[PDB]
Amino acid sequence: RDNIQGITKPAIRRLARRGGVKRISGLIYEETRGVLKVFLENVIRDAVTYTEHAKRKTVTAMDVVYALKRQGRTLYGFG
Amino acid sequence: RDNIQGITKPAIRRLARRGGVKRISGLIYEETRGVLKVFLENVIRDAVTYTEHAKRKTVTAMDVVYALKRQGRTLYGFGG
Amino acid sequence: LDNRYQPMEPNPRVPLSRVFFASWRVVLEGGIDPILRGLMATPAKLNRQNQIAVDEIRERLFEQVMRIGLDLPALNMQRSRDHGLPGYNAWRRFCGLPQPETVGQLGTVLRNLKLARKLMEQYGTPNNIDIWMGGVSEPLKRKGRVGPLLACIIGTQFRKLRDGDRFWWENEGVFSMQQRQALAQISLPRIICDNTGITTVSKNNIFMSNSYPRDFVNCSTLPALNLASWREA
Amino acid sequence: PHRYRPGTVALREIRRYQKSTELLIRKLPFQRLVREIAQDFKTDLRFQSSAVMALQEASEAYLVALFEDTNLCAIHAKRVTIMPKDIQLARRIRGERA
Amino acid sequence: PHRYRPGTVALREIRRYQKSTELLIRKLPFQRLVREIAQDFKTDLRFQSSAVMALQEASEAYLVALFEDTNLCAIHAKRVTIMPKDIQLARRIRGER
Amino acid sequence: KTRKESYAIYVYKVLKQVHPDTGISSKAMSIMNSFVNDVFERIAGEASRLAHYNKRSTITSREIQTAVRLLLPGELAKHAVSEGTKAVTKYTSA
Amino acid sequence: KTRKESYAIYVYKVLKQVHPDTGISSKAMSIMNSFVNDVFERIAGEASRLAHYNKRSTITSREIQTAVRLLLPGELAKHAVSEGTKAVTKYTSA
Amino acid sequence: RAKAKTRSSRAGLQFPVGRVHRLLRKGNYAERVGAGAPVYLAAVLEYLTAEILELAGNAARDNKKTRIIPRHLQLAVRNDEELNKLLGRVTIAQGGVLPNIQSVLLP
Amino acid sequence: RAKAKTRSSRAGLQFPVGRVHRLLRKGNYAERVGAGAPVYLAAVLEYLTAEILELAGNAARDNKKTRIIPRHLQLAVRNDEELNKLLGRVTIAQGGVLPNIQSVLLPK
DNA sequence: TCGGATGTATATATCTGACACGTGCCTGGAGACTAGGGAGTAATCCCCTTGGCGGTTAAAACGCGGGGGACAGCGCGTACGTGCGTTTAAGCGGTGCTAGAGCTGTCTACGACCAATTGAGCGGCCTCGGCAC
DNA sequence: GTGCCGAGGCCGCTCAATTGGTCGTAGACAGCTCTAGCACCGCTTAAACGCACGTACGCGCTGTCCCCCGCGTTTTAACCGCCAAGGGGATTACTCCCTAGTCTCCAGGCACGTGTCAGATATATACATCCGA
């Protein structure tokens, strides 16, 4: 299960271009993959905790929204 | 009324030394004074709002603690 | 209006064409108290795209003191032409607003298509519409009484008059802090209470309260200006 | 053999992707990664489509902001090339790895 | 005529001020500054001693953290001297700008 | 089917007040509803903390006004305070 | 004067249980009281939000456990959950 | 009884005063809630909604669009200093980012 | 009646279960508060206090002092990863800072 | 690479004030009930989640060429740290005044609560034009 | 220019908001009181301020070459349109056990009083460390 490589180098390059980055080093992609993995781990852990507390086997959008809001990353558009 | 100069250059140097700074430029002091004034303005404005809501003329330490907690700077040891 | 805010006999409602340059009404007809009461307790006229200006100022302006009545909107637009002001589209471009070019675009901008046809018939192109006419033909802003172009112009002018004034009351060195706080407690209702014989006066935002006695209070409840901060020792 | 300068197409992409609102990461790989990560906390988990969409939006916004801060850090060091130390410095100052 | 090389006394002061816990800003000037700032919000405002002390502690901690971030920024640029640009970059990244 | 309430009708009414011709999309409605709920929660929590600090069991207009002054930045707080004061005065009159 | 309660004597008992010889000063006691109050407020607020999210009007031990898991990081959450479960089981046994 | 009249109509607003009052009463904020608090809260919410909606409509008009999409909301929020300060830690879905390229990166 | 026993005594706790219950009931947290919530909360608070006090006492012993001052609390908080994460945005009065100097600034 | 010389940690006296213990009191937590409704537990409905398949083609991976920028020297001025002499309010300690924070007693009016009534808004169903193609 | 799918408009209906009265308690108000914040005043004196020097460092210029960008081609799997099963989210009814509420009372916790022992402050010493020689 190696799915962190699913975030390809062109995708990271596109995300950097949206951020105004002109030139990218070759070692940036691994660092970005690690940062994304850490962020997703935290958010998903909080969402799964919220889901278990609700006695459910399905992760809903409200759980993710609450998990993001708990981290000071309020997200608008999903409830 | 120019009390911002009361934060002397040696005091800013001491604060930088506590932060681990070895060499300090000559223009750092004005920037530090401005940053301190902005931070104090925000905190004191929130504290004065808290005091005014309480119909009080004396700013207590608990108002300052509430203001700092509002900015996300919870302070331990003063009040509770 | 009299002390009870009722119509004051005789002549409770006088046509505007009979009050222009008439100081004898101020002198011999009870002074300024009834006039101030009428100003405070009478609704203004709403600006609608089909009701712009009344016929008193449009047909009979300064009728008594002139050989013929004037036309105030016509005078406004003739003065705009005399001053050599640019057209409607130029000022829309100046304020950063879209500039209509056809009758459909003008109707979309004005939100009134029939008014757009009338303006197109009269002028022929939106660039030639006079500044006053285009400004007063625009739909009013929410909680406002001017269009986006007029709001832009007026806001810019008053911002310049405020920031460019050295003796602004909020500017440091003009008034002391205690004097500024004392001046912050003033109100036109309090001035009217102090300087006239009117004892019942509209509440806060005197420019909004217009119906008696729903938005009127007693003159004694208004805080007074404390001049103790002006004492020199 | 018309070849652009090594900086023209980068600026063109910067202007193109700063004017759009789409998602820059393919949906299926991100969904697979999210499921693989969630496998570490609770087995036999089901995901709503809106949950995965919200996770993707949050991750993309976070990465874009981090890359803006990293660009600021790189420009501070008199450079135009984005390097991992810039990312580490930005994360420290933000308070994430601090 | 003995003389220490430039930098030794700086490290000595770093080690001395990172060990003590005393406030590094004079109390009376800071009290005067706090009163001058608070004058803009209310008249005849009275301050408790604990309020001024708490304000001083919070301000000193904030400035120390800001200087740590500034030192990191200056070191990132292959420098040992902090500059106002380092402070501005740190405040931007923190989000205070 | 249960009934889920949201600030969609009121947001649409305000939009028609501001932009009679301009319409809105579904995602924009979702964002508007989330924003309204978030601001409501922030103001209500600040007012509750203000009431708890002063040892009061009642949330009044003063607590809401102080919370608005504390949270909303700059001229936004002043304008919101003026609008709320006008609304409260109008309601008290009627 | 009036009675102002704080977690001072309880903190002293805990310190005596941990370190039977060392003492504590007044400022350290104030800091510990503030820390206890802050953690109490955080956990109680998280439990209240959890109860509101699930449309429940009761704060139970499950809500407190989930709040502890959400706030306390790493091994702190596991150890606190173990201690709380042990205390609840002991209390309900007697 | 007399004909019913909504409290929002009495206050001259369009946001629901009664719904806000019910949410305040059942939201576990205080033991009691005053009669003027819902009116003030509804007025503030309506003012903020009107501000952001007006800015978003202006942004949509600047793009020659008839409808408001999340991109217009993001453009309205991020271009206003006070709204940006209020919604600083808030992510708007499908909002994009403000077009901004650093000067040093230009040729 | 019978000999009254504190609810903390039943749970073997040194923190007040009754006071915590009263604060939960009057804290505007929820309409109803369960019977087992105060015990759990008191246990969690007691564990956290015991851990922080143990670390602070260890730091004070390393400093050959008997009484605990805020400096020891700051050292204990900042020298533990979990406690530092829990108290990242918290300023402890009279705590100072952790002694560190960058390697490049070192004389060489 | 060693002598002086500057700074700092240390073991030893020496006051000292605040932390820990003891005591009286009071008020809130516990004991023993009653009442009611929140939710725990089954049961049922359908919906939206997952797995599968195949066809298009948009995009990712790989390789090659080249240029420009990251990085290492090298120099040069300059400005900041270090030390010394002069000055200035910071701090300490006492003294006096009174402003206001806090507690106590009365009282009233305002929000919670309850019952009856009805219409505002939510879901379902068309319908057409704003916008993606 | 196309058209189609999502925004806009219309109709049940039902539950939530409105209207009309009562109760009691939370909050407003007047009064006393006695902390505690504010305002002089003198003396050290520690710290701030001013200044000269020189040396280490910030900044600019130059050359390398290697690492990253741009483009063509092939492969890959993302993406999209249907199809099916079914696990599980969501709703409904019964009831029972858990929690709110109340009178009694008594003991744990808080305010006050105090003394002595950890701790702050000199002092001479022994090193710890740094800089030419």
Ligand SMILES: *[C@@H]1O[C@H](CO[C@@H]2O[C@@H](C)[C@@H](O)[C@@H](O)[C@@H]2O)[C@@H](O[C@@H]2O[C@H](CO)[C@@H](O[C@@H]3O[C@H](CO[C@H]4O[C@H](CO)[C@@H](O)[C@H](O)[C@@H]4O)[C@@H](O)[C@H](O[C@H]4O[C@H](CO)[C@@H](O)[C@H](O)[C@@H]4O)[C@@H]3O)[C@H](O)[C@H]2NC(C)=O)[C@H](O)[C@H]1NC(C)=O
């Ligand atoms: C053709 O050019 C037109 C003029 O171009 C000018 O000259 C060229 C060479 C460029 O330098 C260009 O930038 C110059 O503007 C151009 O029309 C211009 O459009 C701009 C942008 O819309 C207008 O500026 C706006 O003006 C008003 C008023 O503010 C101004 O005037 C007052 C008084 O003089 C000053 O105090 C101000 O500082 C300004 O000078 C405002 O509506 C607005 O500012 C507010 O609005 C914007 C967004 O709405 C906010 O960002 C701001 O913060 C403010 O809230 C702008 O400043 C400019 O007036 C207008 N010029 C003229 C002469 O009409 C046009 O677009 C070009 N045509 C094409 C097809 O490109």
